[PDB]
Amino acid sequence: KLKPFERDISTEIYQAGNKPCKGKGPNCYFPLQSYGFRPTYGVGHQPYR
Amino acid sequence: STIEEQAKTFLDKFNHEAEDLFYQSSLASWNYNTNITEENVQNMNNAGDKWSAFLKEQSTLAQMYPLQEIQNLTVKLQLQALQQNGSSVLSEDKSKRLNTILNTMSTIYSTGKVCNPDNPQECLLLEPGLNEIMANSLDYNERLWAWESWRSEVGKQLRPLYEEYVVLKNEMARANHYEDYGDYWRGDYEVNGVDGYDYSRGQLIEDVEHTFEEIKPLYEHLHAYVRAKLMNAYPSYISPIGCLPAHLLGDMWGRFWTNLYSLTVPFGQKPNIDVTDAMVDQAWDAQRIFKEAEKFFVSVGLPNMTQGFWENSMLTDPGNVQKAVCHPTAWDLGKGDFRILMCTKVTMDDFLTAHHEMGHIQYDMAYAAQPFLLRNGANEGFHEAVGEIMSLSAATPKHLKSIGLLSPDFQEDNETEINFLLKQALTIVGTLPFTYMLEKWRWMVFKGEIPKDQWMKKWWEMKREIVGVVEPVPHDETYCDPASLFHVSNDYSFIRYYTRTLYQFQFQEALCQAAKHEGPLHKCDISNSTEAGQKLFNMLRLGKSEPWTLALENVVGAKNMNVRPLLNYFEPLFTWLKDQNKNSFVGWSTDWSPYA
Numbered sequence: 147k148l149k150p151f152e153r154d155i156s157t158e159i160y161q162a163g164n165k166p167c168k169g170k171g172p173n174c175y176f177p178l179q180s181y182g183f184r185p186t187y188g189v190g191h192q193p194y195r
Numbered sequence: 196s197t198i199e200e201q202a203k204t205f206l207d208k209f210n211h212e213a214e215d216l217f218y219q220s221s222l223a224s225w226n227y228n229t230n231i232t233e234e235n236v237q238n239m240n241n242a243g244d245k246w247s248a249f250l251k252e253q254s255t256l257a258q259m260y261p262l263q264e265i266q267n268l269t270v271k272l273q274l275q276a277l278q279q280n281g282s283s284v285l286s287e288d289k290s291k292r293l294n295t296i297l298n299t300m301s302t303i304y305s306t307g308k309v310c311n312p313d314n315p316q317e318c319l320l321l322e323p324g325l326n327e328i329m330a331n332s333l334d335y336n337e338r339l340w341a342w343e344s345w346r347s348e349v350g351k352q353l354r355p356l357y358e359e360y361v362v363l364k365n366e367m368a369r370a371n372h373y374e375d376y377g378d379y380w381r382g383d384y385e386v387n388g389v390d391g392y393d394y395s396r397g398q399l400i401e402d403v404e405h406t407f408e409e410i411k412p413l414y415e416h417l418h419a420y421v422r423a424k425l426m427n428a429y430p431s432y433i434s435p436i437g438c439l440p441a442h443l444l445g446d447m448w449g450r451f452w453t454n455l456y457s458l459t460v461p462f463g464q465k466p467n468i469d470v471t472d473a474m475v476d477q478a479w480d481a482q483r484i485f486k487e488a489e490k491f492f493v494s495v496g497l498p499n500m501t502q503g504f505w506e507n508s509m510l511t512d513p514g515n516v517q518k519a520v521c522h523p524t525a526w527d528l529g530k531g532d533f534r535i536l537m538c539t540k541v542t543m544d545d546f547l548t549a550h551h552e553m554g555h556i557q558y559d560m561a562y563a564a565q566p567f568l569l570r571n572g573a574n575e576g577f578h579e580a581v582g583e584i585m586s587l588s589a590a591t592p593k594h595l596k597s598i599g600l601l602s603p604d605f606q607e608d609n610e611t612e613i614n615f616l617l618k619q620a621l622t623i624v625g626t627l628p629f630t631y632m633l634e635k636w637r638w639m640v641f642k643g644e645i646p647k648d649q650w651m652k653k654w655w656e657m658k659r660e661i662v663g664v665v666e667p668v669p670h671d672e673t674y675c676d677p678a679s680l681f682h683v684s685n686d687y688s689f690i691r692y693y694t695r696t697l698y699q700f701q702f703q704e705a706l707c708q709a710a711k712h713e714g715p716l717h718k719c720d721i722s723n724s725t726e727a728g729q730k731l732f733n734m735l736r737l738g739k740s741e742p743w744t745l746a747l748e749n750v751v752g753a754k755n756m757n758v759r760p761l762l763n764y765f766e767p768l769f770t771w772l773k774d775q776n777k778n779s780f781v782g783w784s785t786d787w788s789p790y791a
């Protein structure tokens with residue numbers, strides 16, 4: 147969980163498994179992911195101001 | 196963390212990636228379907244290839260996760276499916292040969308043709324004229340010759356390909372841990388790991404045999420009645436107590452008996468429900484039909500279609516230089532996108548097809564928030580049953596009277612209701628024994644109990660013994676009769692429809708019981724029954740996260756498929772057939788042969 151008034155943006159290597167994934171490897175993903183705001187898309191991928 | 200957390204994170208990442216990739220592939224395929232261009236073809240091929248490569252690599256990476264350290268009972272099933280579905284066990288040459296055989300079978304079935312003798316100047320394919328000839332022409336000799344020529348030109352050239360394909364499938368099964376390819380096919384319904392709900396692959400054969408034995412009296416009465424009716428049309432070509440020819444079923448493959456309804460109508464003088472005339476007179480177009488279908492879906496409690504569905508589902512073909520396939524299909528692209536692709540006309544059959552597609556779309560809309568791997572039904576027949584029950588409920592005259600297309604002064608009595616029941620029987624039950632026979636034959640050919648040099652002989656014996664239809668002209672081992680069918684050509688499971696009929700009839704009876712419906716079973720509706728809708732939605736959201744037995748019990752309270760709803764739905768029809776068959780012999784004679 148984050149803290150109030152936070153600007154966390156990072157496509158860094160997420161510690162998903164138990165191993166110290168400082169580099170890369172299996173079960174090693176990234177927390178921040180692209181959205182893909184598409185006008186055709188409805189619930190879950192719609193922009194809101 | 197632990198192994199469970201690692202598996203959960205891997206499954207979540209795979210689901211998130213696969214949702215987008217499958218959405219891209221489905222979008223490219225939809226663009227090709229609604230706009231047939233070379234660029235669309237290239238894009239669809241590239242998207243499909245990338246999706247297949249992603250599935251293969253994900254399945255290969257998933258092999259590092261053991262299945263004996265999972266207590267969720269949902270992550271384990273997803274991991275097992277990933278390991279068994281996207282991965283390959285056969286060698287490269289074997290897979291290439293199997294793909295080549297599949298491509299050759301598809302090409303030969305798509306462009307199959309046969310034409311008049313000693314005149315190769317002009318010929319026509321099976322789809323344009325042969326189906327029309329089988330469904331309209333009344334000439335016994337010409338129909339028999341066309342059937343014989345099609346069988347000779349299909350099975351003789353498909354026998355080596357079918358043999359090679361079945362040998363490769365047997366090799367794949369041997370590499371697997373299942374009994375055979377038929378065992379692998381039956382394993383789709385297998386449920387393991389749960390006490391009190393375990394299932395076995397071999398139980399399906401016994402269950403189908405039991406259902407066929409239970410349905411035997413109705414089917415034999417129907418066959419006797421059809422033979423008696425045809426005795427007044429082709430007395431010399433059909434034995435009075437023997438077996439009907441295979442080419443007098445109204446179609447090339449003899450799957451459905453609907454085409455013979457007009458020829459052998461029990462009562463041609465009774466008025467018929469012609470909603471097409473009222474639809475044409477009152478300007479009922481595709482827009483109005485779709486709006487009425489949406490209203491019916493809202494009345495049964497299902498949520499209305501949103502703007503995405505309406506702007507993503509084509510209604511009428513643009514035409515002109517634009518060409519699109521008129522095969523009715525419903526699209527499940529994920530990401531909250533669902534489309535319907537069909538050529539719609541102002542007919543009752545097209546109305547039923549539209550209701551079918553809308554029911555399928557609503558079923559696909561019932562697991563929007565569920566994981567991508569769980570975005571599917573436990574059994575392949577559940578999806579079709581859900582798609583068909585809405586059409587069955589709409590097809591009843593009560594909804595037609597409520598809308599107003601049917602005349603409010605229309606009456607219902609014994610004759611009209613019997614005719615409707617017989618039409619429904621010829622549409623549905625007319626293929627169920629054929630479905631069982633062909634599924635059993637495929638089971639034997641996959642297992643290999645029947646010798647290959649005796650395949651045709653055993654096929655003829657099964658046709659003469661269980662089907663009750665004698666062959667007008669015999670074929671030796673050089674021919675491959677079942678290869679002429681689409682299901683056999685594409686090697687698809689031929690038990691989906693048999694289970695689907697029972698599932699949909701059980702669902703219909705359960706919803707009619709929950710709606711407190713009164714009167715005969717075949718006149719029932721759930722238009723203003725929200726409890727039935729809630730009961731259905733209870734099963735809809737389960738998906739693959741729950742066993743199919745529990746899902747079926749949550750609606751009908753039965754632990755297995757039962758044909759008793761099917762028999763009860765047609766009880767007046769059975770009584771009418773029994774009354775009509777007093778002077779008609781019932782049964783099939785194996786000794787008799789039309790070819791001397």
Ligand SMILES: *[C@@H]1O[C@H](CO)[C@@H](O[C@@H]2O[C@H](CO)[C@@H](O[C@@H]3O[C@H](CO[C@H]4O[C@H](CO)[C@@H](O)[C@H](O)[C@@H]4O)[C@@H](O)[C@H](O[C@H]4O[C@H](CO)[C@@H](O)[C@H](O)[C@@H]4O)[C@@H]3O)[C@H](O)[C@H]2NC(C)=O)[C@H](O)[C@H]1NC(C)=O
Pocket residue numbers: 276280523524525526527552555568571578579582
């Ligand atoms: C493991 O991986 C495989 C693929 O490698 C996945 O298999 C696919 O599963 C889906 C759904 O289970 C299949 O989609 C359905 O296929 C049925 C097969 O029919 C074939 O023949 C008809 C012509 O008669 C074709 O039109 C059709 O495209 C098929 O080629 C269809 O009958 C189904 O259509 C029904 O539903 C739609 C709505 O979706 C309605 O519009 C239709 O009218 C009809 O009622 C449906 O299309 C898909 O075909 C399977 N692929 C293959 C190659 O067989 C597994 O899902 C996957 N398992 C996992 C991930 O767990």
Ligand SMILES: *[C@@H]1O[C@H](CO)[C@@H](O[C@@H]2O[C@H](CO)[C@@H](O[C@@H]3O[C@H](CO)[C@@H](O)[C@H](O)[C@@H]3O)[C@H](O)[C@H]2NC(C)=O)[C@H](O)[C@H]1NC(C)=O
Pocket residue numbers: 203266267269270
């Ligand atoms: C098997 O794995 C799945 C996937 O993680 C587990 O599902 C998860 O279950 C928890 C609750 O046990 C869900 O937490 C939810 O939190 C919200 C608040 O944000 C709360 O309102 C909900 O009532 C719920 O508690 C979590 O969302 C859910 N995750 C998914 C993807 O469905 C499941 O519990 C595991 N089963 C076992 C037996 O461990």
Ligand SMILES: *[C@@H]1O[C@H](CO)[C@@H](O)[C@H](O)[C@H]1NC(C)=O
Pocket residue numbers: 230232234513517
């Ligand atoms: C189909 O695709 C072509 C080329 O991509 C495009 O010009 C056309 O507008 C599209 N739609 C129709 C109906 O042709």
Ligand SMILES: *[C@@H]1O[C@H](CO)[C@@H](O)[C@H](O)[C@H]1NC(C)=O
Pocket residue numbers: 493496497498499500
């Ligand atoms: C869906 O259809 C229309 C949309 O306005 C409305 O009349 C109806 O009440 C809606 N029902 C639901 C359940 O959303």
Ligand SMILES: *[C@@H]1O[C@H](CO)[C@@H](O)[C@H](O)[C@H]1NC(C)=O
Pocket residue numbers: 609613767770771774
């Ligand atoms: C005719 O209708 C009556 C209802 O009073 C029913 O009892 C009878 O079985 C029907 N006859 C046939 C042949 O279905």
